[PDB]
Design a protein around this ligand. Structure first.
Ligand SMILES: CC(C)=CCC/C(C)=C/CC/C(C)=C/COP(=O)(O)C(Cl)(Cl)P(=O)(O)O
Ligand SMILES: CC(C)=CCC/C(C)=C/CC/C(C)=C/COP(=O)(O)C(Cl)(Cl)P(=O)(O)O
Ligand SMILES: [Mg+2]
Ligand SMILES: [Mg+2]
Ligand SMILES: [Mg+2]
Ligand SMILES: [Mg+2]
Lengths: 519, 510
């Protein structure tokens, strides 16, 4: 291709086209790790171990063993093992809440005096880092978790880059970039396999399984990218003079939303939809005229491609691929799930293009919307209602029009995720546009760039609190949609840290290069 | 356990010496170019053709044939029945006219001289040449009836192993009516038995066959994954649709360089067989009208009014037609969706007329039924699609023209339907004579339309390769497959065998 993509599509197909020795060894090491999760340990040691299993990307292999470990630890009658221990209190608080076992913010009170958190806690970095990490599991009105974040952030930053203990130095720097709660499972696993190997408390059996299982999952990913690349070259959209790296960037995002091998077909369909969202966003933003885009929108609204030949090739090809792929995805729901998803996929595309039109209307009129006007439209235009409603269609038991209507109605859980994805993307922009979060709020309140960014950062923390509380009352939603909704937010944080070199490094270590085994 | 050719589990698993091939290709290139006696040359390029290798040497074979057509001294074939017959056929095969009068030496005013009954090689070449004939070429008709009788009479009495095999093979189907790719597998075995076998040509035939087979295996993997993805493998009205369609497609075109077109033709074939069963066996009256209406308007709004087992074929037809039309836009610069939507609407209209006859108790003339039955067989759909995907600079104008079914295309489509009706309402329609006498009449229409096909290849035509080859090769596919459709017993094991030898099992080398 010209310009060049991150990797050539012929090479990406190369990848998928792990010796039987290793699958057998993997089942063996898996049973040995089950035994370790099950085995009697001191409660702190057990929490540390299952936190390690999670960060290595292995919770999906041990869901039963990890939850049962966590329930056991919540039943442990004597509290002396965590009381007055900042690290143990913090980790317990976090692991309990991550597993739907409530722990009050009051457990942190004893670490404060009249003026706030006790300055002397700065003498224990491991404790500060566990406090920092735990603070992100907090809800609205949990003021002590807000103080904990501010204090632990401030104290860790006063040492970032200058910690003379390699593994804690790396983890502190990594955490201040993004807290574990905000990071993807799959990209964290690759980073943490390296970190873990350098740590004092390393279990070589767990580490050996983490590398083996990483490589096996990666081989499924390599076959998916082969299929997706073949599909993408098949559409001819790799040759559009826009949306360079559209397919690989969508797929890398998808791995953040869902990495598990058993969700391969769903992941491939989400990656196809992301590649089309990126492509068609560029059709609307950096190619089409207002008149071309009116016809694109109208064809989509009516699901009628009669007039498609009035669009030039570079606009007609994206339109008809959106149409053909949406029909294929809808058809999969009929074939696999017994429910024709074409009305649903046609509807979320119509909603999305309507949001683009409103954005373009404002941009042409010169209109300068408020933050709340901007976000009600921009949470649609980012594409996550499309991606998430589609993910629900493809996974809900017994899909129905009424269920799909409900998800597309933005229950608080979904609205939070979509607003978060939009605001996180907007915060990732560097040198400047009246139609992004920061400038809309600047325009509203007469605020500076600095004060407006601080405001938007606060909105990020607030919507995470609602996300967190929604999981303690998941209401009509179940796995895997619960995970999808949170993990698209983590994808956004990871891919919009406030470049192509970083993206290639991430794609190289997670998708292309197996972890070297000493087996 | 034996691998099941009908198991989509097995078929989905398919896909998962080139230096010697390129070396031996140049050696074979050199053998077609090197000087030989003009008869030995014709024999050599006929051998190349029959080994399914002509596609590798189109330019060397044509120039060989042109060189022989200019060889000035005729002493090498005059009064030699084999040589006269081989020259006739190879020349006409290459669009160089030879009159039927070259077979004057071998007949008088009373016909072919009964003396020739001992001359097995001669009789076989005469028989094969006769099928290159046109209408009113009555010497070629007489050569056929005569060669056929004399060949039947000597069959089990031929000492040469390879000549005995060739006579028995020719009497089932002349070479002209056989597919290239299925014949290539057969002929590799027979050729190895011949006295004049060229071991370089035989080694390259095997190597190229296995290389091309590996291409087809990747195609069947992709197509089987697609078919399982549609869910149509789990439908009632089942008939191993995809694998059968693919086995037909291989008769229509086998060349690796036509892979994508072959896959799309195989998909359309699988959908035609499936939807025909929807209209002929499973669908209610009200269901078929909605299907037809949805297709006519290319509007799937009301799809949900159809039950699962009908909605799935419908949406797959819609989705696949949109994909194929899209491929034309992407690859050929022309949006083919209006074209694929039209050939499906026309096909479903042929299904509506079948029912308007059955329910109104109407009984059509042979000419009436065949006007409709040449559309319903689905070869307009397949051939118009093949033209959309291959024609240089496609346009609506050119697509309306092919879809009007001018003689060349109409002859192929009638031949496909007639050949099919010969192997189980063509016979019933002509009868409304008896069974035996209609059949004999319909066999006659086969010979007739073949002569019109043959002539079309000499006449001015908008059409070029590869569509000229597609149009003749569907007819060969029909000849080869038409009497093994039943899907049990002898029919099923002969089909499985063809499937296994040409698609699955490589040719052992050394
Ligand atoms: C989870 C998944 C499969 C994601 C697919 C990739 C998608 C569609 C990501 C949406 C976020 C992206 C890539 C934003 C970059 O696009 P931009 O043109 O800057 C824009 Cl933020 Cl959409 P906008 O057009 O509003 O300025
Ligand atoms: C060259 C190519 C890709 C062929 C694809 C396969 C196709 C469409 C084969 C058509 C011949 C077949 C399988 C006929 C058997 O079907 P039938 O229902 O008996 C029938 Cl002859 Cl179509 P009809 O409905 O007229 O009785
Ligand atoms: Mg954009
Ligand atoms: Mg945009
Ligand atoms: Mg039928
Ligand atoms: Mg029929």
């Amino acid at each position: 291709n010209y310009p060049p993509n991150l990797w050539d599509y012929e090479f990406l197909q190369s990848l998928g086209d792990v010796e039987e020795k290793h699958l057998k060894l993997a089942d063996k090491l898996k049973e040995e790790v089950k035994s370790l999760i099950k085995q009697t340990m001191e409660p702190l040691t057990k929490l540390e171990f299952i936190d390690t299993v999670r960060r290595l990307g292995l919770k999906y292999q041990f869901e039963t063993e990890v939850k049962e470990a966590v329930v056991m630890v919540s039943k442990y009658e004597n509290d002396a093992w965590w009381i007055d221990n900042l690290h143990a209190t913090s980790l317990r608080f976090r692991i309990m809440r991550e597993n739907g076992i409530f722990v009050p913010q009051d457990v942190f009170e004893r670490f404060k005096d009249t003026d706030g958190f006790k300055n002397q806690l700065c003498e224990d970095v491991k404790g500060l880092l566990s406090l920092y990490e735990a603070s992100f599991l907090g809800w609205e009105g949990e003021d002590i978790l807000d103080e904990a974040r501010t204090f632990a952030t401030s104290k860790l930053k006063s040492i970032e880059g200058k910690i003379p203990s390699p593994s804690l130095a790396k983890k502190v720097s990594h955490a201040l970039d993004l807290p574990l709660h905000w990071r993807t499972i799959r990209y964290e696993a690759r980073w943490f396999i390296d970190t873990y190997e350098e740590e004092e408390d390393v279990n070589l059996t767990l580490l050996r399984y983490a590398k083996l299982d990483f490589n096996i999952v990666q081989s499924f990913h390599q076959k998916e990218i082969g299929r997706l690349s073949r599909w993408w070259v098949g559409t001819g959209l790799d040759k559009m003079p826009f949306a360079r790296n559209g397919l690989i960037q969508s797929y890398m995002y998808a791995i953040g939303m869902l990495f598990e091998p058993n969700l391969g077909e769903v992941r491939e369909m989400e990656a196809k939809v992301g590649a089309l969202i990126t492509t068609i966003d560029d059709v609307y933003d950096v190619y089409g005229t207002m008149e071309e885009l009116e016809l694109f929108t109208d064809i989509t609204n009516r699901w009628d491609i009669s007039k498609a030949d009035q669009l030039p090739r570079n606009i007609r090809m994206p339109l008809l691929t959106m149409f053909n792929t949406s029909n294929d995805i809808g058809y999969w729901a009929l074939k696999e799930r017994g429910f024709n998803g074409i009305p649903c996929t046609a509807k979320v595309w119509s909603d999305q293009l309507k949001s683009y039109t409103k954005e373009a209307k404002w941009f042409h009129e010169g209109h300068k919307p408020t933050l709340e006007e901007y976000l009600d439209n921009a949470l649609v235009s980012i594409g996550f209602p499309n991606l998430l409603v589609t993910s629900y269609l493809l996974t809900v038991e017994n899909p129905t029009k009424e269920k799909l209507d409900y998800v597309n109605s933005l229950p608080l859980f979904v609205r939070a995720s979509c607003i978060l994805c939009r605001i996180i993307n907007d915060l990732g922009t560097s040198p400047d546009d009246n139609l992004k979060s920061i400038q809309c709020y600047m325009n509203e309140a007469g605020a500076s760039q600095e004060v407006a960014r601080e405001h938007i950062e606060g909105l990020v923390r607030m919507w995470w609190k609602r996300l967190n509380k929604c999981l303690f009352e998941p209401s009509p939603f179940a796995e895997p949609f619960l995970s999808f909704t949170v993990n698209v937010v983590r994808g956004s944080h990871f891919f919009y840290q406030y470049a192509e070199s970083w993206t290639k490094k991430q794609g190289m270590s997670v998708l292309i290069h197996p972890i070297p085994l000493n087996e």
